[PDB]
Short mmCIF file of C-alpha atoms and ligand atoms in Angstrom, two decimals:
data_model
loop_
_atom_site.label_atom_id
_atom_site.label_comp_id
_atom_site.label_asym_id
_atom_site.label_seq_id
_atom_site.Cartn_x
_atom_site.Cartn_y
_atom_site.Cartn_z
CA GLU A 6 -16.67 8.82 7.74
CA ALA A 7 -18.28 12.58 7.94
CA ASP A 8 -14.67 14.13 8.08
CA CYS A 9 -13.02 12.28 5.56
CA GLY A 10 -10.58 13.85 2.91
CA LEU A 11 -10.73 17.16 5.18
CA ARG A 12 -7.02 17.46 6.10
CA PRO A 13 -6.44 18.61 9.30
CA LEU A 14 -3.28 20.68 8.29
CA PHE A 15 -4.04 22.36 4.97
CA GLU A 16 -8.20 22.39 4.57
CA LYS A 17 -9.07 22.57 8.49
CA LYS A 18 -6.24 25.55 8.99
CA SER A 19 -7.40 27.33 5.54
CA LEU A 20 -3.37 26.12 3.59
CA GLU A 21 -3.04 24.94 0.17
CA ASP A 22 -0.81 22.49 -0.61
CA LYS A 23 1.76 23.75 -3.37
CA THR A 24 0.28 22.24 -6.19
CA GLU A 25 -3.26 21.70 -5.56
CA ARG A 26 -4.13 24.75 -7.44
CA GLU A 27 -2.54 22.41 -10.49
CA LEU A 28 -5.59 20.09 -9.85
CA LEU A 29 -8.43 23.20 -9.64
CA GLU A 30 -7.00 24.78 -12.68
CA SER A 31 -7.10 21.30 -14.77
CA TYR A 32 -10.95 21.53 -13.70
CA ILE A 33 -11.31 25.01 -15.86
CA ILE B 1 7.05 8.15 -8.74
CA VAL B 2 9.24 9.44 -11.36
CA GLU B 3 9.92 12.73 -11.29
CA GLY B 4 7.48 13.53 -8.85
CA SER B 5 8.41 15.43 -6.00
CA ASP B 6 8.26 16.07 -2.22
CA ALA B 7 5.26 15.96 -0.05
CA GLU B 8 4.62 18.48 2.81
CA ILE B 9 4.15 17.22 5.96
CA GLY B 10 0.39 15.80 6.62
CA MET B 11 -0.06 16.29 2.88
CA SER B 12 -1.19 12.88 2.15
CA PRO B 13 -2.70 11.44 5.87
CA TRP B 14 -4.41 8.73 4.13
CA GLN B 15 -1.40 7.38 2.75
CA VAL B 16 -0.18 3.91 4.36
CA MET B 17 3.20 1.43 3.74
CA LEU B 18 2.49 -1.83 3.29
CA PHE B 19 5.20 -3.76 4.91
CA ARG B 20 6.43 -7.79 4.73
CA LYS B 21 7.38 -8.61 8.20
CA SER B 22 10.44 -11.12 7.49
CA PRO B 23 12.68 -9.91 6.57
CA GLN B 24 11.50 -6.26 6.63
CA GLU B 25 10.80 -4.86 3.47
CA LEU B 26 8.36 -2.26 1.81
CA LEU B 27 6.21 -3.46 -0.10
CA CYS B 28 3.00 -1.24 -1.70
CA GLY B 29 1.32 1.35 -1.13
CA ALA B 30 -2.19 1.34 0.57
CA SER B 31 -4.82 4.19 1.56
CA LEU B 32 -6.82 4.61 5.21
CA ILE B 33 -10.53 4.66 4.71
CA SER B 34 -11.52 4.32 7.52
CA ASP B 35 -9.57 3.38 11.24
CA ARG B 36 -10.12 0.20 10.78
CA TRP B 37 -9.89 -0.35 6.87
CA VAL B 38 -7.40 0.09 4.56
CA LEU B 39 -7.11 -0.24 0.59
CA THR B 40 -4.37 -1.67 -1.61
CA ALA B 41 -4.02 -3.80 -4.76
CA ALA B 42 -4.78 -7.21 -4.54
CA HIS B 43 -1.34 -7.69 -7.02
CA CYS B 44 0.22 -6.64 -3.90
CA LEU B 45 -0.83 -9.58 -1.87
CA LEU B 46 -1.45 -11.86 -4.89
CA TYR B 47 0.01 -12.46 -7.82
CA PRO B 48 1.26 -16.66 -8.32
CA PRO B 49 3.07 -16.63 -11.70
CA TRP B 50 5.57 -14.85 -9.25
CA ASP B 51 5.27 -16.69 -6.09
CA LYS B 52 4.02 -14.03 -4.43
CA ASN B 53 1.01 -15.25 -2.09
CA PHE B 54 0.67 -13.15 1.98
CA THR B 55 -1.47 -13.89 4.40
CA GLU B 56 -2.31 -11.25 6.71
CA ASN B 57 0.12 -12.91 9.36
CA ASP B 58 2.82 -11.74 6.86
CA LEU B 59 2.58 -8.19 6.73
CA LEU B 60 2.16 -5.15 9.11
CA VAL B 61 0.95 -1.47 7.65
CA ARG B 62 2.71 1.53 8.63
CA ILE B 63 0.43 4.70 8.90
CA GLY B 64 1.22 8.53 9.86
CA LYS B 65 4.36 10.73 9.57
CA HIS B 66 7.97 8.53 8.64
CA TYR B 71 15.75 14.71 16.04
CA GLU B 72 11.65 14.31 16.02
CA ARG B 73 9.38 11.78 18.38
CA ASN B 74 8.55 8.76 16.06
CA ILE B 75 4.76 9.59 15.59
CA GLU B 76 4.70 6.69 12.69
CA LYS B 77 1.79 3.77 13.65
CA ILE B 78 2.40 0.39 12.97
CA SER B 79 -0.48 -1.90 13.17
CA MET B 80 -1.62 -5.79 12.01
CA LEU B 81 -4.11 -6.81 9.78
CA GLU B 82 -7.09 -9.07 10.82
CA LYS B 83 -8.10 -10.39 7.50
CA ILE B 84 -7.38 -9.75 3.81
CA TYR B 85 -9.67 -9.39 1.33
CA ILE B 86 -8.88 -9.91 -2.63
CA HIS B 87 -11.48 -9.61 -4.92
CA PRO B 88 -13.21 -12.76 -5.90
CA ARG B 89 -12.94 -11.96 -9.39
CA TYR B 90 -9.58 -10.61 -9.40
CA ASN B 91 -7.86 -11.89 -12.81
CA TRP B 92 -4.36 -12.71 -11.86
CA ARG B 93 -4.05 -14.50 -15.01
CA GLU B 94 -4.53 -12.27 -17.67
CA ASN B 95 -4.73 -8.51 -16.98
CA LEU B 96 -5.19 -7.54 -13.62
CA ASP B 97 -8.49 -7.03 -14.08
CA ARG B 98 -10.38 -5.76 -10.52
CA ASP B 99 -6.58 -5.20 -9.09
CA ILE B 100 -9.02 -4.50 -5.37
CA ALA B 101 -7.90 -5.59 -1.89
CA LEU B 102 -8.90 -4.64 1.70
CA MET B 103 -7.28 -4.79 4.86
CA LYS B 104 -9.03 -5.08 8.11
CA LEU B 105 -6.64 -3.81 10.99
CA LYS B 106 -6.41 -5.63 14.05
CA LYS B 107 -7.46 -2.94 16.31
CA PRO B 108 -8.78 0.87 15.20
CA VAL B 109 -6.14 3.41 14.38
CA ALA B 110 -6.56 6.90 16.17
CA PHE B 111 -6.72 10.01 13.59
CA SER B 112 -4.47 12.80 14.20
CA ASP B 113 -2.54 15.58 11.89
CA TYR B 114 -0.63 13.06 10.17
CA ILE B 115 -3.35 10.15 10.19
CA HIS B 116 -6.61 11.09 8.85
CA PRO B 117 -9.15 8.85 6.17
CA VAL B 118 -9.55 9.68 2.37
CA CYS B 119 -13.58 10.17 0.71
CA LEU B 120 -14.11 7.21 -1.70
CA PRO B 121 -16.50 8.85 -4.38
CA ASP B 122 -20.32 8.31 -5.10
CA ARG B 123 -21.79 8.47 -8.21
CA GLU B 124 -21.77 12.17 -8.73
CA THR B 125 -18.33 12.80 -7.71
CA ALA B 126 -17.45 10.06 -10.04
CA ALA B 127 -18.59 11.19 -13.14
CA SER B 128 -18.22 15.23 -12.09
CA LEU B 129 -14.36 14.18 -12.04
CA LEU B 130 -12.69 11.54 -13.69
CA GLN B 131 -12.99 12.43 -17.15
CA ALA B 132 -10.21 13.10 -19.69
CA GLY B 133 -7.66 15.94 -19.21
CA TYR B 134 -8.46 16.45 -15.39
CA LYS B 135 -5.47 15.87 -13.12
CA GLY B 136 -5.75 13.37 -9.98
CA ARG B 137 -2.87 13.10 -7.62
CA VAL B 138 -0.55 10.07 -6.94
CA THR B 139 1.44 9.82 -4.08
CA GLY B 140 4.14 6.56 -2.89
CA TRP B 141 7.60 5.48 -1.52
CA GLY B 142 8.10 3.57 -4.56
CA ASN B 143 11.58 4.44 -7.14
CA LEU B 144 12.18 7.12 -8.50
CA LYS B 145 13.93 5.97 -11.82
CA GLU B 146 12.38 2.74 -13.64
CA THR B 147 16.43 1.28 -13.63
CA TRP B 148 19.59 2.97 -11.76
CA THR B 149 23.03 1.38 -11.09
CA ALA B 150 23.35 0.51 -7.58
CA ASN B 151 25.35 2.88 -5.65
CA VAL B 152 25.83 5.37 -8.36
CA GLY B 153 22.14 6.91 -8.86
CA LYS B 154 19.61 7.34 -6.86
CA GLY B 155 16.59 4.92 -7.00
CA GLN B 156 14.65 5.00 -3.71
CA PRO B 157 13.08 8.24 -2.00
CA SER B 158 13.76 9.75 1.41
CA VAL B 159 10.47 11.38 1.86
CA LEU B 160 7.44 10.79 0.40
CA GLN B 161 6.83 11.50 -3.72
CA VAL B 162 3.52 13.21 -5.44
CA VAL B 163 2.96 13.99 -8.80
CA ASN B 164 0.03 15.27 -10.53
CA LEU B 165 -1.17 13.37 -13.90
CA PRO B 166 -4.04 14.25 -16.12
CA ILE B 167 -6.67 11.51 -16.62
CA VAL B 168 -6.24 10.18 -20.45
CA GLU B 169 -9.40 9.43 -22.53
CA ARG B 170 -9.71 5.45 -22.73
CA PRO B 171 -9.29 5.87 -26.65
CA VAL B 172 -5.60 6.70 -26.11
CA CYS B 173 -5.43 4.15 -23.31
CA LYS B 174 -6.37 1.06 -25.34
CA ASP B 175 -4.27 2.11 -28.12
CA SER B 176 -1.38 2.56 -25.93
CA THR B 177 -0.68 -1.06 -24.98
CA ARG B 178 -1.18 -4.12 -26.31
CA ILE B 179 -2.95 -5.64 -22.92
CA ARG B 180 -6.51 -6.07 -23.14
CA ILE B 181 -7.41 -3.13 -20.25
CA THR B 182 -11.62 -3.72 -19.10
CA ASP B 183 -13.81 -0.55 -17.60
CA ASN B 184 -12.38 -1.52 -14.21
CA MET B 185 -9.16 0.33 -15.12
CA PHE B 186 -8.43 3.97 -16.45
CA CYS B 187 -4.61 5.32 -17.28
CA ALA B 188 -3.21 8.62 -16.50
CA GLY B 189 -0.35 10.60 -17.38
CA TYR B 190 1.11 13.45 -20.52
CA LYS B 191 1.11 12.41 -23.71
CA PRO B 192 4.96 12.46 -25.60
CA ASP B 193 3.29 16.19 -27.04
CA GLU B 194 2.41 17.60 -23.67
CA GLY B 195 5.58 18.75 -22.32
CA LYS B 196 5.43 17.66 -18.93
CA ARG B 197 6.05 14.38 -17.17
CA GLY B 198 5.34 12.18 -14.36
CA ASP B 199 4.08 8.62 -13.66
CA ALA B 200 4.14 5.94 -10.64
CA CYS B 201 6.74 2.93 -10.84
CA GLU B 202 8.01 0.14 -8.62
CA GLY B 203 6.64 0.20 -4.71
CA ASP B 204 3.98 2.41 -5.55
CA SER B 205 1.29 -0.32 -6.80
CA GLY B 206 -1.53 -0.12 -3.93
CA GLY B 207 -1.39 3.76 -3.20
CA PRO B 208 -4.24 6.27 -3.95
CA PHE B 209 -5.18 8.51 -7.21
CA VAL B 210 -7.12 11.55 -5.52
CA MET B 211 -8.69 14.06 -6.68
CA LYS B 212 -10.19 17.19 -4.82
CA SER B 213 -14.09 18.26 -5.56
CA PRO B 214 -14.16 22.07 -6.27
CA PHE B 215 -17.67 21.03 -4.42
CA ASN B 216 -16.96 20.24 -1.57
CA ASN B 217 -13.02 20.78 -1.02
CA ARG B 218 -12.76 16.47 0.14
CA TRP B 219 -10.13 14.45 -1.06
CA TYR B 220 -11.86 11.54 -3.04
CA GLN B 221 -10.02 8.34 -4.20
CA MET B 222 -10.72 7.57 -7.54
CA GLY B 223 -8.02 5.25 -8.65
CA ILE B 224 -6.08 2.76 -6.95
CA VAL B 225 -2.06 2.50 -8.75
CA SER B 226 -2.09 -0.72 -10.82
CA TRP B 227 0.26 -1.56 -13.09
CA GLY B 228 2.13 -0.46 -16.47
CA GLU B 229 4.65 -1.30 -19.19
CA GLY B 230 7.37 0.70 -17.85
CA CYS B 231 8.13 3.82 -15.65
CA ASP B 232 7.53 7.23 -17.47
CA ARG B 233 7.81 6.19 -21.08
CA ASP B 234 6.94 8.24 -23.24
CA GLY B 235 3.75 7.40 -25.09
CA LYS B 236 2.71 5.05 -22.28
CA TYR B 237 0.44 5.32 -19.31
CA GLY B 238 -0.03 3.87 -15.65
CA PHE B 239 -3.28 2.15 -15.04
CA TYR B 240 -5.30 2.69 -12.03
CA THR B 241 -8.08 0.59 -10.54
CA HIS B 242 -11.70 2.19 -11.25
CA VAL B 243 -12.54 2.41 -7.37
CA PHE B 244 -15.97 3.83 -7.62
CA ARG B 245 -16.96 1.10 -10.50
CA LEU B 246 -15.85 -1.66 -7.46
CA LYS B 247 -17.66 0.44 -4.81
CA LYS B 248 -20.38 -2.29 -4.66
CA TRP B 249 -17.81 -4.66 -3.66
CA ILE B 250 -16.21 -2.64 -1.11
CA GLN B 251 -19.30 -1.98 0.35
CA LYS B 252 -20.29 -5.70 0.56
CA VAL B 253 -17.07 -6.29 2.44
CA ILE B 254 -17.36 -3.51 4.92
CA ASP B 255 -21.17 -4.20 5.96
CA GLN B 256 -20.74 -8.04 6.09
CA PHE B 257 -17.53 -8.09 8.59
O1 LIG C 1 2.86 -3.47 -13.21
C1 LIG C 1 3.26 -3.08 -12.91
C2 LIG C 1 3.86 -3.58 -11.62
C3 LIG C 1 2.65 -5.39 -11.58
S1 LIG C 1 4.01 -6.21 -11.75
C4 LIG C 1 3.32 -7.75 -11.42
C5 LIG C 1 2.44 -8.26 -12.93
C6 LIG C 1 1.45 -8.34 -13.14
C7 LIG C 1 0.40 -8.41 -14.32
C8 LIG C 1 1.18 -8.38 -15.30
C9 LIG C 1 2.56 -8.51 -15.34
C10 LIG C 1 3.46 -8.45 -14.11
C11 LIG C 1 0.50 -8.83 -16.45
S2 LIG C 1 -0.86 -8.04 -16.91
C12 LIG C 1 -1.05 -6.73 -16.06
C13 LIG C 1 -0.15 -5.75 -16.82
C14 LIG C 1 0.78 -5.51 -16.31
C15 LIG C 1 2.62 -4.50 -17.28
N1 LIG C 1 3.55 -4.65 -15.77
C16 LIG C 1 4.51 -5.25 -16.30
O2 LIG C 1 4.62 -6.16 -17.07
C17 LIG C 1 5.77 -5.00 -15.19
C18 LIG C 1 6.88 -6.16 -14.90
C19 LIG C 1 7.59 -5.71 -13.70
C20 LIG C 1 8.55 -4.59 -13.81
N2 LIG C 1 7.35 -3.41 -13.97
C21 LIG C 1 6.65 -3.88 -15.39
C22 LIG C 1 7.01 -2.69 -12.82
O3 LIG C 1 7.80 -3.00 -12.06
C23 LIG C 1 5.69 -1.40 -12.97
C24 LIG C 1 5.49 -0.76 -11.63
C25 LIG C 1 4.50 0.14 -11.74
C26 LIG C 1 3.57 -0.13 -11.17
C27 LIG C 1 2.52 0.98 -11.47
C28 LIG C 1 2.20 1.43 -12.56
CL1 LIG C 1 0.29 2.71 -12.67
C29 LIG C 1 3.62 1.65 -12.64
C30 LIG C 1 4.50 1.15 -12.71
N3 LIG C 1 4.08 -1.95 -13.49
C1 LIG C 2 -2.69 -18.07 -1.83
O1 LIG C 2 -3.43 -18.38 -0.71
C2 LIG C 2 -3.03 -19.22 0.29
C3 LIG C 2 -1.38 -20.37 0.04
O2 LIG C 2 -1.48 -19.80 1.80
C4 LIG C 2 -3.53 -20.37 -0.55
O3 LIG C 2 -4.73 -20.79 0.53
C5 LIG C 2 -4.67 -22.35 0.53
O4 LIG C 2 -5.96 -23.32 0.10
C6 LIG C 2 -6.96 -22.83 0.26
C7 LIG C 2 -7.36 -21.72 -0.92
O5 LIG C 2 -9.16 -22.13 -0.74
C8 LIG C 2 -7.50 -21.97 1.61
O6 LIG C 2 -8.47 -21.58 2.29
C9 LIG C 2 -6.37 -22.47 2.54
O7 LIG C 2 -6.29 -21.72 4.10
C10 LIG C 2 -4.89 -22.35 2.10
N1 LIG C 2 -4.32 -23.53 2.74
C11 LIG C 2 -2.90 -23.55 3.63
C12 LIG C 2 -2.41 -24.81 4.00
O8 LIG C 2 -3.14 -22.35 4.50
C13 LIG C 2 -4.60 -19.58 -1.53
O9 LIG C 2 -5.45 -19.99 -2.39
C14 LIG C 2 -3.47 -19.21 -2.73
N2 LIG C 2 -4.16 -18.31 -3.61
C15 LIG C 2 -4.09 -18.81 -5.12
C16 LIG C 2 -4.56 -18.11 -6.08
O10 LIG C 2 -3.19 -19.66 -5.46
#
């Protein structure tokens, strides 16, 4: 699907969930 | 999810609940990978040693948000597909199942599919120390005295867990693990904790690509010797390593 994994209430609104930065910070 | 926490509304819109029809009972987690296709663990559906053997007609799934108008969506299954080489006899190798919905589901703010990974994504993430996310409605404690203690959740639970090196995985357990599964969780040294538990099986392990901000389902909650035990880790079906089988089923039906 072309729009898969983009969440209407988060990525599509430019909002971050509470704990996702913890995922990104683990890639650094 | 042991030692997790409450998900926000819409935080995991590919989440699917697998229910037994009679008597109505939450059974497992799943993930929405298209409008008509749902991903889960084979052992949710088939475990002969325990007399588990379900067919499409024994089940329904529940998708979307769980006064407020009930916006949750119930749907039936056309067909189940257990991997042909699912090793229920020994080690739960290839613990993967596909379920086609009777009629397609309409996406919304609460219902949206997750991406399956491609070679570059799986190789680029899915390394030790990188964290993925697990979500489910499964138990909060491995054991609880009934009526004295809380064990089942009221909202979807979430926990972020780091992938573990394969050698640490292998050495943590006497079960013969294969390239078709990986493990995640904090080491006793690491301070933090958390894990999948009974009832979280079949649900997704997702990671956010920093490259395109999309969520990929890297794993399926498969098995674990306990919930949140020191020195022990949850095992996940390696989705990319089984993608060829996922393609074969969808492209043919
Ligand atoms: O494997 C499970 C659920 C599958 S249970 C059926 C089964 C299949 C295969 C087998 C034994 C049992 C033997 S080969 C694969 C090894 C499985 C090891 N496991 C058990 O023996 C369980 C025994 C029951 C209590 N118990 C532990 C559970 O409730 C949890 C729940 C859980 C699920 C996922 C994660 Cl990530 C973490 C925890 N672990
Ligand atoms: C679990 O599922 C069913 C039990 O309902 C078993 O399927 C039966 O036997 C063959 C197996 O190839 C099926 O094609 C038939 O449709 C079933 N029979 C009936 C009466 O409906 C199935 O094989 C069991 N799986 C295992 C691993 O034992």
